[PDB]
Amino acid sequence: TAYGCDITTNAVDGFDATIYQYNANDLRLIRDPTFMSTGYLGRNVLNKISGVTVPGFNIWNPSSRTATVYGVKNVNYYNMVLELKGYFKADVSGDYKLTLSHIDDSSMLFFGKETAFKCCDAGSIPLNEAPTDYSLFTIKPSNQVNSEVISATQYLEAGKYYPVRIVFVNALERARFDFKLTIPSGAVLDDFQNYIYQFGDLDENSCHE
Ligand SMILES: CC(=O)N[C@@H]1[C@@H](O)[C@H](O[C@@H]2O[C@H](CO)[C@@H](O)[C@H](O)[C@H]2NC(C)=O)[C@@H](CO)O[C@H]1O
Ligand SMILES: [Ca+2]
């Protein structure tokens, strides 16, 4: 019923990142759509990181299985599942494209229809969440280059919010997660600041007076 609210002061910038354990050298599960969509959720959580506006990275240190990822030291980039979630806000109306390029090892992207809101005095509550059907699934062929560039373009309405989830797996060595946004102007962005948000929780007893 409401796809927006006057008061959205509880919206804050950035993807929420969750990093999970993944067995080093496992080149099977990176190709398994059930694992990439749901199965990873059963693994031990290694890190939780908020406020991420630049989600892409390309990391390979032959001398260390850890690296600084999203400002956090000693992240086990060598073998991990990364889950990024948030609400994508269209600024202007038009076609927006999300592209995954040369991913090492694999990535699956989910991008939902517009979320409805419950509007409260202290901010807005998105009602819509866990888009469950993937749009894009890209996998680096074992031991050869990932030449794949895969994209999803859809029309977004100005000011509306669209839940998004991206799952990325590195099985071993290089972690290449190249995730870009093309906006209706044609500009290609690696920085999602002012497009990607979370909504802070609020006391639902005091939603209204
Ligand atoms: C059989 C073997 O060891 N081949 C080497 C490749 O593994 C290696 O590329 C690696 O492929 C993995 C599986 O697709 C990737 O997860 C991993 O990130 C990647 N490693 C790097 C450093 O890119 C290539 C790299 O040239 O060398 C082969 O000899
Ligand atoms: Ca890899």
Coordinates of N, CA and C and ligand atoms in Angstrom, one line a residue:
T1 N 0.8 -1.3 0.0 CA 0.0 0.0 0.0 C 0.9 1.3 0.0
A2 N 1.8 1.5 1.0 CA 2.7 2.7 0.9 C 4.1 2.2 0.4
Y3 N 4.5 2.8 -0.7 CA 5.9 2.5 -1.2 C 6.9 3.5 -0.8
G4 N 6.5 4.4 0.1 CA 7.4 5.5 0.6 C 6.8 6.1 1.8
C5 N 7.6 6.9 2.5 CA 7.2 7.6 3.7 C 7.8 9.0 3.7
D6 N 7.1 10.0 4.4 CA 7.7 11.3 4.5 C 9.0 11.3 5.4
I7 N 8.9 10.5 6.5 CA 10.1 10.4 7.4 C 10.9 9.1 7.2
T8 N 12.1 9.3 6.7 CA 13.0 8.2 6.4 C 14.3 8.4 7.1
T9 N 14.3 9.1 8.3 CA 15.5 9.5 9.0 C 16.3 8.4 9.5
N10 N 15.7 7.2 9.6 CA 16.3 6.0 10.1 C 17.1 5.2 9.0
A11 N 17.0 5.7 7.8 CA 17.8 5.1 6.7 C 19.3 5.5 6.8
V12 N 20.2 4.5 6.8 CA 21.6 4.8 7.0 C 22.3 4.1 5.8
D13 N 23.5 4.5 5.5 CA 24.2 4.1 4.3 C 24.7 2.7 4.5
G14 N 24.7 2.0 3.4 CA 25.6 0.8 3.2 C 25.0 -0.5 3.2
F15 N 25.7 -1.5 2.5 CA 25.4 -2.9 2.7 C 25.8 -3.3 4.1
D16 N 25.1 -4.3 4.6 CA 25.5 -5.1 5.7 C 26.2 -6.4 5.1
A17 N 27.4 -6.6 5.5 CA 28.2 -7.7 5.1 C 28.3 -8.8 6.2
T18 N 28.0 -10.0 5.8 CA 28.2 -11.2 6.7 C 29.2 -12.1 6.0
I19 N 30.3 -12.5 6.7 CA 31.3 -13.4 6.2 C 31.2 -14.7 6.9
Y20 N 31.1 -15.8 6.2 CA 30.9 -17.1 6.7 C 32.1 -18.0 6.3
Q21 N 32.3 -19.0 7.1 CA 33.3 -20.0 6.8 C 33.0 -20.8 5.5
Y22 N 34.0 -21.1 4.8 CA 33.9 -21.9 3.6 C 35.1 -22.8 3.5
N23 N 35.0 -24.1 3.2 CA 36.1 -25.0 3.1 C 37.0 -24.7 2.0
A24 N 38.3 -24.5 2.3 CA 39.3 -24.2 1.3 C 39.3 -25.3 0.3
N25 N 39.4 -24.8 -1.0 CA 39.5 -25.7 -2.2 C 38.3 -26.4 -2.6
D26 N 37.2 -26.1 -2.0 CA 35.9 -26.7 -2.3 C 35.4 -26.1 -3.6
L27 N 35.6 -26.7 -4.7 CA 35.1 -26.2 -6.0 C 33.8 -26.8 -6.5
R28 N 33.1 -27.5 -5.6 CA 31.8 -28.0 -5.8 C 30.7 -27.1 -5.4
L29 N 30.8 -26.6 -4.2 CA 29.7 -25.8 -3.7 C 29.5 -24.5 -4.3
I30 N 30.6 -23.9 -4.9 CA 30.5 -22.7 -5.6 C 29.6 -22.7 -6.8
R31 N 29.4 -23.9 -7.3 CA 28.5 -24.2 -8.4 C 27.1 -24.7 -8.1
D32 N 26.8 -24.8 -6.8 CA 25.6 -25.4 -6.3 C 24.6 -24.3 -6.0
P33 N 23.5 -24.2 -6.8 CA 22.6 -23.1 -6.5 C 21.9 -23.1 -5.2
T34 N 21.7 -24.3 -4.6 CA 21.1 -24.3 -3.3 C 22.1 -23.8 -2.2
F35 N 23.3 -24.2 -2.4 CA 24.3 -23.7 -1.4 C 24.4 -22.1 -1.5
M36 N 24.5 -21.6 -2.7 CA 24.7 -20.2 -2.9 C 23.5 -19.4 -2.5
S37 N 22.3 -20.0 -2.5 CA 21.1 -19.3 -2.2 C 20.7 -19.4 -0.7
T38 N 20.9 -20.6 -0.1 CA 20.5 -20.9 1.3 C 21.5 -21.6 2.1
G39 N 22.2 -22.6 1.5 CA 23.1 -23.5 2.2 C 24.2 -22.8 3.0
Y40 N 24.7 -21.7 2.5 CA 25.8 -21.0 3.2 C 25.4 -20.6 4.6
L41 N 24.1 -20.3 4.8 CA 23.6 -19.8 6.0 C 23.9 -20.7 7.2
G42 N 24.1 -21.9 7.0 CA 24.4 -22.9 8.0 C 25.8 -22.9 8.5
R43 N 26.7 -22.1 7.9 CA 28.1 -22.1 8.2 C 28.4 -21.1 9.3
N44 N 29.5 -21.3 10.0 CA 30.0 -20.4 11.1 C 30.2 -19.0 10.5
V45 N 29.7 -18.0 11.2 CA 29.9 -16.6 10.9 C 31.3 -16.2 11.4
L46 N 32.0 -15.6 10.5 CA 33.4 -15.1 10.8 C 33.4 -13.6 11.1
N47 N 32.6 -12.8 10.4 CA 32.5 -11.4 10.5 C 31.2 -10.8 10.2
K48 N 30.8 -9.7 10.8 CA 29.7 -8.9 10.5 C 30.2 -7.4 10.4
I49 N 29.9 -6.8 9.2 CA 30.5 -5.5 8.9 C 29.4 -4.7 8.3
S50 N 29.1 -3.5 8.8 CA 28.1 -2.6 8.3 C 28.7 -1.4 7.6
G51 N 27.9 -0.6 6.9 CA 28.3 0.7 6.3 C 29.1 0.6 5.0
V52 N 29.0 -0.5 4.4 CA 29.8 -0.8 3.2 C 29.2 -0.1 2.0
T53 N 29.8 0.9 1.3 CA 29.3 1.5 0.1 C 30.1 1.1 -1.1
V54 N 31.3 0.6 -1.0 CA 32.1 0.2 -2.1 C 32.3 -1.4 -1.9
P55 N 31.5 -2.2 -2.5 CA 31.5 -3.6 -2.2 C 32.5 -4.4 -2.9
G56 N 33.0 -3.9 -4.1 CA 33.9 -4.7 -4.9 C 35.3 -4.8 -4.3
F57 N 36.0 -5.8 -4.6 CA 37.4 -6.0 -4.2 C 38.1 -7.1 -5.1
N58 N 39.4 -7.1 -5.1 CA 40.2 -8.1 -5.8 C 41.4 -8.3 -5.1
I59 N 41.4 -9.4 -4.3 CA 42.4 -9.7 -3.3 C 43.1 -11.0 -3.6
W60 N 44.4 -10.9 -3.6 CA 45.2 -12.1 -3.7 C 46.6 -11.8 -3.1
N61 N 46.9 -12.5 -1.9 CA 48.2 -12.4 -1.3 C 48.8 -13.8 -1.2
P62 N 49.8 -14.1 -2.1 CA 50.4 -15.4 -2.1 C 51.0 -15.8 -0.7
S63 N 51.2 -14.8 0.1 CA 51.9 -15.0 1.4 C 51.0 -14.9 2.6
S64 N 49.7 -14.7 2.4 CA 48.7 -14.7 3.5 C 47.3 -15.1 3.0
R65 N 46.6 -15.9 3.9 CA 45.2 -16.2 3.6 C 44.2 -15.2 4.2
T66 N 44.8 -14.2 4.9 CA 43.9 -13.1 5.4 C 44.3 -11.8 4.8
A67 N 43.4 -10.8 4.9 CA 43.6 -9.5 4.4 C 42.6 -8.6 5.0
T68 N 42.8 -7.3 4.8 CA 41.9 -6.3 5.2 C 40.8 -6.2 4.2
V69 N 39.5 -6.4 4.7 CA 38.4 -6.4 3.8 C 37.3 -5.5 4.4
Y70 N 36.9 -4.5 3.7 CA 36.0 -3.5 4.2 C 36.4 -2.9 5.5
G71 N 37.7 -2.6 5.6 CA 38.3 -1.9 6.8 C 38.6 -2.7 8.0
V72 N 38.3 -4.0 7.9 CA 38.4 -5.0 8.9 C 39.7 -5.8 8.7
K73 N 40.6 -5.8 9.6 CA 41.8 -6.6 9.5 C 41.6 -8.1 9.6
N74 N 42.5 -8.8 9.0 CA 42.6 -10.3 9.2 C 41.3 -11.0 8.8
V75 N 40.6 -10.6 7.8 CA 39.5 -11.3 7.2 C 40.0 -12.4 6.3
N76 N 39.4 -13.6 6.5 CA 39.9 -14.8 5.8 C 39.4 -14.8 4.4
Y77 N 39.9 -13.9 3.5 CA 39.5 -13.7 2.1 C 39.7 -15.0 1.3
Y78 N 40.7 -15.8 1.6 CA 41.2 -17.0 0.8 C 40.1 -18.0 0.7
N79 N 39.2 -18.2 1.7 CA 38.2 -19.1 1.6 C 37.1 -18.7 2.5
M80 N 36.0 -18.2 1.9 CA 34.9 -17.5 2.6 C 33.7 -17.5 1.8
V81 N 32.5 -17.3 2.4 CA 31.3 -16.8 1.8 C 31.1 -15.4 2.3
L82 N 30.8 -14.5 1.4 CA 30.4 -13.2 1.7 C 28.9 -13.0 1.3
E83 N 28.1 -12.5 2.2 CA 26.8 -12.1 1.9 C 26.6 -10.6 2.2
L84 N 26.2 -9.9 1.1 CA 25.9 -8.5 1.2 C 24.4 -8.3 1.1
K85 N 23.8 -7.5 2.0 CA 22.3 -7.2 1.9 C 22.1 -5.7 2.2
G86 N 21.0 -5.2 1.6 CA 20.5 -3.9 1.8 C 19.4 -3.5 1.0
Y87 N 19.0 -2.3 1.0 CA 17.9 -1.7 0.2 C 18.4 -0.7 -0.8
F88 N 18.3 -1.0 -2.1 CA 18.7 -0.2 -3.1 C 17.6 0.9 -3.4
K89 N 18.0 2.2 -3.3 CA 17.1 3.3 -3.6 C 17.4 3.8 -5.0
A90 N 16.3 3.9 -5.8 CA 16.5 4.6 -7.1 C 16.4 6.1 -6.8
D91 N 17.3 6.9 -7.3 CA 17.3 8.3 -7.2 C 16.3 8.9 -8.2
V92 N 16.6 8.5 -9.4 CA 15.8 8.9 -10.6 C 15.1 7.7 -11.2
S93 N 14.1 7.9 -11.9 CA 13.4 6.7 -12.6 C 14.3 6.3 -13.8
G94 N 14.2 5.0 -14.1 CA 14.9 4.5 -15.3 C 15.4 3.1 -15.1
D95 N 16.2 2.7 -16.1 CA 16.8 1.4 -16.1 C 18.1 1.5 -15.3
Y96 N 18.2 0.6 -14.3 CA 19.4 0.4 -13.5 C 19.9 -1.0 -13.8
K97 N 21.2 -1.1 -14.0 CA 21.9 -2.4 -14.3 C 22.9 -2.7 -13.2
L98 N 22.8 -4.0 -12.8 CA 23.8 -4.6 -11.8 C 24.6 -5.6 -12.6
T99 N 25.9 -5.5 -12.5 CA 26.8 -6.3 -13.3 C 27.7 -7.0 -12.4
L100 N 27.9 -8.3 -12.6 CA 28.9 -9.1 -12.0 C 29.9 -9.5 -13.1
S101 N 31.2 -9.2 -12.8 CA 32.3 -9.3 -13.8 C 33.5 -10.1 -13.3
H102 N 33.9 -11.1 -14.1 CA 35.1 -11.9 -13.9 C 35.2 -12.4 -12.4
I103 N 34.1 -12.9 -11.9 CA 34.1 -13.3 -10.5 C 34.9 -14.5 -10.2
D104 N 35.7 -14.4 -9.2 CA 36.5 -15.6 -8.7 C 36.2 -15.7 -7.2
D105 N 35.5 -16.8 -6.8 CA 35.1 -17.9 -7.5 C 33.6 -17.9 -8.1
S106 N 32.7 -17.4 -7.3 CA 31.3 -17.4 -7.7 C 30.5 -16.4 -7.0
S107 N 29.4 -16.0 -7.7 CA 28.5 -15.0 -7.1 C 27.0 -15.2 -7.6
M108 N 26.1 -15.0 -6.7 CA 24.7 -15.1 -7.0 C 24.0 -13.8 -6.5
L109 N 23.2 -13.2 -7.3 CA 22.5 -12.0 -7.0 C 21.0 -12.1 -7.0
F110 N 20.4 -11.5 -6.0 CA 18.9 -11.5 -5.8 C 18.5 -10.0 -5.7
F111 N 17.5 -9.6 -6.5 CA 17.1 -8.2 -6.5 C 15.6 -8.1 -6.6
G112 N 15.0 -7.6 -5.5 CA 13.5 -7.7 -5.3 C 12.8 -6.6 -6.0
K113 N 11.5 -6.8 -6.0 CA 10.6 -5.8 -6.4 C 10.5 -4.8 -5.3
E114 N 9.9 -3.6 -5.6 CA 9.8 -2.6 -4.7 C 9.3 -2.9 -3.3
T115 N 9.9 -2.5 -2.2 CA 9.4 -2.8 -0.9 C 8.3 -1.8 -0.5
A116 N 7.3 -2.3 0.1 CA 6.3 -1.5 0.8 C 6.9 -1.1 2.2
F117 N 6.2 -0.1 2.8 CA 6.7 0.5 4.0 C 5.5 0.6 5.0
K118 N 5.8 0.5 6.3 CA 5.0 1.0 7.4 C 5.7 2.3 7.8
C119 N 5.0 3.4 7.8 CA 5.5 4.7 8.1 C 5.2 5.1 9.5
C120 N 6.3 5.4 10.3 CA 6.2 5.8 11.7 C 6.8 7.2 11.9
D121 N 6.6 7.7 13.1 CA 7.1 9.0 13.5 C 8.6 9.1 13.4
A122 N 9.2 8.1 13.9 CA 10.7 8.0 14.0 C 11.4 7.5 12.8
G123 N 10.6 7.0 11.8 CA 11.2 6.5 10.5 C 10.3 5.5 9.9
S124 N 10.9 4.8 8.9 CA 10.1 3.9 8.0 C 10.6 2.4 8.3
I125 N 9.6 1.5 8.1 CA 9.9 0.1 8.3 C 9.6 -0.6 7.0
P126 N 10.6 -1.1 6.3 CA 10.4 -1.9 5.1 C 9.7 -3.2 5.4
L127 N 8.7 -3.5 4.7 CA 7.9 -4.7 4.9 C 8.4 -5.9 4.1
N128 N 9.2 -5.7 3.0 CA 9.5 -6.7 2.0 C 11.0 -7.0 1.9
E129 N 11.3 -8.3 1.8 CA 12.5 -8.8 2.2 C 12.6 -10.2 1.9
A130 N 13.9 -10.8 2.0 CA 14.2 -12.0 1.4 C 13.5 -12.3 0.1
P131 N 13.9 -11.6 -1.0 CA 13.8 -12.1 -2.3 C 14.6 -13.4 -2.4
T132 N 14.0 -14.4 -3.0 CA 14.4 -15.8 -2.8 C 14.9 -16.4 -4.1
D133 N 14.4 -15.8 -5.2 CA 14.8 -16.3 -6.6 C 15.9 -15.5 -7.1
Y134 N 17.0 -16.1 -7.4 CA 18.2 -15.4 -8.0 C 17.9 -14.9 -9.4
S135 N 18.7 -13.8 -9.7 CA 18.7 -13.3 -11.1 C 19.9 -13.8 -11.8
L136 N 21.1 -13.6 -11.1 CA 22.4 -13.9 -11.8 C 23.1 -14.9 -10.9
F137 N 23.8 -15.8 -11.6 CA 24.7 -16.8 -11.0 C 25.9 -16.9 -12.0
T138 N 27.0 -16.5 -11.5 CA 28.3 -16.6 -12.3 C 29.3 -17.4 -11.5
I139 N 30.0 -18.3 -12.2 CA 30.9 -19.2 -11.6 C 32.2 -19.2 -12.5
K140 N 33.4 -19.1 -11.8 CA 34.7 -19.2 -12.5 C 34.9 -20.7 -12.8
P141 N 35.1 -21.0 -14.1 CA 35.4 -22.4 -14.4 C 36.7 -22.8 -13.7
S142 N 36.7 -24.1 -13.2 CA 37.8 -24.5 -12.4 C 39.1 -24.4 -13.1
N143 N 40.0 -23.6 -12.5 CA 41.4 -23.5 -12.9 C 41.5 -22.7 -14.2
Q144 N 40.5 -22.1 -14.7 CA 40.6 -21.2 -15.9 C 39.9 -19.8 -15.7
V145 N 40.2 -18.9 -16.6 CA 39.7 -17.5 -16.5 C 38.2 -17.4 -16.4
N146 N 37.7 -16.5 -15.6 CA 36.2 -16.2 -15.7 C 36.0 -15.0 -16.6
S147 N 35.6 -15.3 -17.9 CA 35.5 -14.3 -18.9 C 34.0 -13.8 -18.9
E148 N 33.2 -14.3 -17.9 CA 31.8 -13.9 -17.9 C 31.6 -12.5 -17.3
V149 N 30.7 -11.8 -18.0 CA 30.2 -10.6 -17.5 C 28.7 -10.7 -17.6
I150 N 28.0 -10.8 -16.5 CA 26.5 -11.0 -16.5 C 25.8 -9.9 -15.8
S151 N 24.7 -9.5 -16.3 CA 24.0 -8.3 -15.8 C 22.5 -8.5 -15.8
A152 N 21.9 -7.7 -14.9 CA 20.5 -7.6 -14.8 C 20.1 -6.1 -14.8
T153 N 19.2 -5.8 -15.7 CA 18.7 -4.4 -15.9 C 17.2 -4.4 -15.7
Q154 N 16.7 -3.5 -14.9 CA 15.3 -3.4 -14.7 C 15.0 -1.9 -14.4
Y155 N 13.7 -1.6 -14.7 CA 13.2 -0.2 -14.5 C 12.9 0.0 -13.0
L156 N 13.5 1.0 -12.5 CA 13.2 1.4 -11.1 C 12.6 2.8 -11.1
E157 N 11.7 3.0 -10.1 CA 11.0 4.2 -9.9 C 11.7 5.1 -9.0
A158 N 11.8 6.4 -9.3 CA 12.4 7.4 -8.4 C 11.9 7.3 -7.0
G159 N 12.8 7.2 -6.1 CA 12.5 7.3 -4.6 C 12.1 6.0 -4.0
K160 N 11.9 4.9 -4.8 CA 11.5 3.7 -4.3 C 12.7 2.8 -3.9
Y161 N 12.4 1.9 -3.0 CA 13.5 1.0 -2.4 C 13.3 -0.4 -2.8
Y162 N 14.4 -1.1 -3.1 CA 14.4 -2.5 -3.7 C 15.4 -3.3 -2.9
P163 N 14.9 -4.4 -2.2 CA 15.8 -5.2 -1.4 C 16.8 -5.9 -2.4
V164 N 18.1 -6.0 -2.0 CA 19.1 -6.7 -2.8 C 19.9 -7.6 -1.8
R165 N 20.3 -8.7 -2.4 CA 21.3 -9.6 -1.7 C 22.3 -10.1 -2.7
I166 N 23.5 -10.1 -2.4 CA 24.6 -10.7 -3.2 C 25.4 -11.6 -2.4
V167 N 25.6 -12.8 -2.9 CA 26.4 -13.8 -2.2 C 27.6 -14.0 -3.1
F168 N 28.8 -14.0 -2.5 CA 30.1 -14.2 -3.2 C 30.8 -15.3 -2.4
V169 N 31.4 -16.2 -3.2 CA 32.3 -17.3 -2.6 C 33.7 -17.2 -3.2
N170 N 34.7 -17.2 -2.3 CA 36.0 -17.6 -2.7 C 36.4 -18.9 -2.1
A171 N 36.7 -19.9 -3.0 CA 37.1 -21.2 -2.6 C 38.6 -21.3 -2.2
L172 N 39.5 -20.5 -2.9 CA 40.9 -20.5 -2.6 C 41.5 -19.4 -3.4
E173 N 42.7 -18.9 -2.9 CA 43.5 -18.0 -3.5 C 42.8 -16.7 -3.8
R174 N 42.8 -16.2 -5.1 CA 42.3 -14.9 -5.4 C 40.8 -14.8 -5.1
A175 N 40.4 -13.7 -4.5 CA 38.9 -13.4 -4.3 C 38.7 -12.1 -5.2
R176 N 38.0 -12.3 -6.3 CA 37.7 -11.2 -7.2 C 36.2 -11.0 -7.2
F177 N 35.7 -9.9 -6.6 CA 34.3 -9.6 -6.6 C 34.1 -8.2 -7.2
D178 N 33.7 -8.2 -8.4 CA 33.5 -7.0 -9.2 C 32.0 -6.9 -9.5
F179 N 31.5 -5.8 -8.9 CA 30.0 -5.6 -8.8 C 29.8 -4.2 -9.0
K180 N 29.1 -3.9 -10.2 CA 29.0 -2.5 -10.6 C 27.6 -2.1 -10.9
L181 N 27.3 -0.8 -10.8 CA 26.0 -0.3 -11.0 C 26.1 0.7 -12.1
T182 N 25.2 0.5 -13.1 CA 25.0 1.5 -14.1 C 23.7 2.1 -13.9
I183 N 23.7 3.5 -13.8 CA 22.5 4.2 -13.5 C 21.9 4.8 -14.8
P184 N 20.7 5.3 -14.7 CA 20.0 5.7 -16.0 C 20.7 6.7 -16.8
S185 N 21.6 7.6 -16.2 CA 22.4 8.5 -17.0 C 23.5 7.8 -17.9
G186 N 23.8 6.5 -17.6 CA 24.8 5.8 -18.3 C 26.1 5.7 -17.4
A187 N 26.2 6.4 -16.3 CA 27.4 6.4 -15.5 C 27.5 5.0 -14.8
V188 N 28.7 4.5 -14.8 CA 29.0 3.2 -14.2 C 29.7 3.5 -12.9
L189 N 29.1 2.9 -11.8 CA 29.6 3.2 -10.4 C 30.1 2.0 -9.7
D190 N 31.2 2.1 -9.0 CA 31.6 1.0 -8.0 C 31.2 1.4 -6.6
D191 N 30.8 2.7 -6.4 CA 30.4 3.2 -5.1 C 28.9 3.4 -5.1
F192 N 28.3 2.7 -4.1 CA 26.8 2.7 -4.0 C 26.3 3.7 -2.9
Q193 N 27.2 4.5 -2.4 CA 26.7 5.5 -1.5 C 25.6 6.4 -2.1
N194 N 24.6 6.6 -1.3 CA 23.4 7.3 -1.7 C 22.4 6.4 -2.6
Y195 N 22.8 5.2 -2.8 CA 21.9 4.2 -3.4 C 21.6 3.0 -2.5
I196 N 22.5 2.7 -1.6 CA 22.3 1.5 -0.8 C 22.1 1.8 0.7
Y197 N 21.1 1.3 1.3 CA 20.7 1.6 2.7 C 20.3 0.5 3.5
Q198 N 20.3 0.7 4.8 CA 19.6 -0.1 5.8 C 18.6 0.9 6.5
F199 N 17.6 0.3 7.1 CA 16.6 1.0 7.9 C 16.8 0.6 9.3
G200 N 17.1 1.5 10.2 CA 17.2 1.3 11.6 C 15.9 0.8 12.2
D201 N 16.0 -0.1 13.1 CA 14.8 -0.6 13.8 C 14.2 0.5 14.6
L202 N 12.9 0.4 14.9 CA 12.3 1.4 15.8 C 11.3 0.7 16.7
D203 N 10.9 1.3 17.8 CA 10.0 0.7 18.7 C 8.6 0.8 18.1
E204 N 8.0 -0.4 17.8 CA 6.8 -0.5 17.0 C 5.6 0.0 17.9
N205 N 5.7 0.0 19.2 CA 4.7 0.5 20.1 C 4.6 2.0 19.9
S206 N 5.6 2.7 19.5 CA 5.6 4.2 19.4 C 5.7 4.6 17.9
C207 N 5.2 3.7 17.0 CA 5.3 4.0 15.6 C 4.4 5.3 15.4
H208 N 3.2 5.2 15.9 CA 2.4 6.4 16.0 C 2.1 6.8 17.5
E209 N 1.4 7.9 17.6 CA 1.0 8.4 18.9 C -0.5 8.1 19.3
Ligands
LIG1 C1 45.4 -27.0 -11.2 C2 45.9 -25.6 -10.7 O1 46.5 -25.5 -9.6 N1 45.8 -24.6 -11.6 C3 46.1 -23.2 -11.2 C4 44.8 -22.5 -11.0 O2 44.2 -23.0 -9.8 C5 45.1 -21.0 -10.7 O3 43.9 -20.3 -10.7 C6 43.1 -20.5 -9.5 O4 41.9 -21.1 -9.9 C7 41.0 -21.3 -8.8 C8 39.9 -22.2 -9.2 O5 39.2 -21.6 -10.3 C9 40.6 -20.0 -8.3 O6 39.7 -20.1 -7.2 C10 41.8 -19.2 -7.8 O7 41.5 -17.9 -7.3 C11 42.9 -19.1 -8.9 N2 44.1 -18.5 -8.4 C12 44.6 -17.4 -8.9 C13 45.9 -16.9 -8.2 O8 44.1 -16.7 -9.8 C14 45.9 -20.4 -11.9 C15 46.3 -19.0 -11.8 O9 47.1 -18.6 -13.0 O10 47.1 -21.2 -12.0 C16 46.9 -22.6 -12.4 O11 48.1 -23.3 -12.6
CA2 CA 39.5 -18.0 -5.8

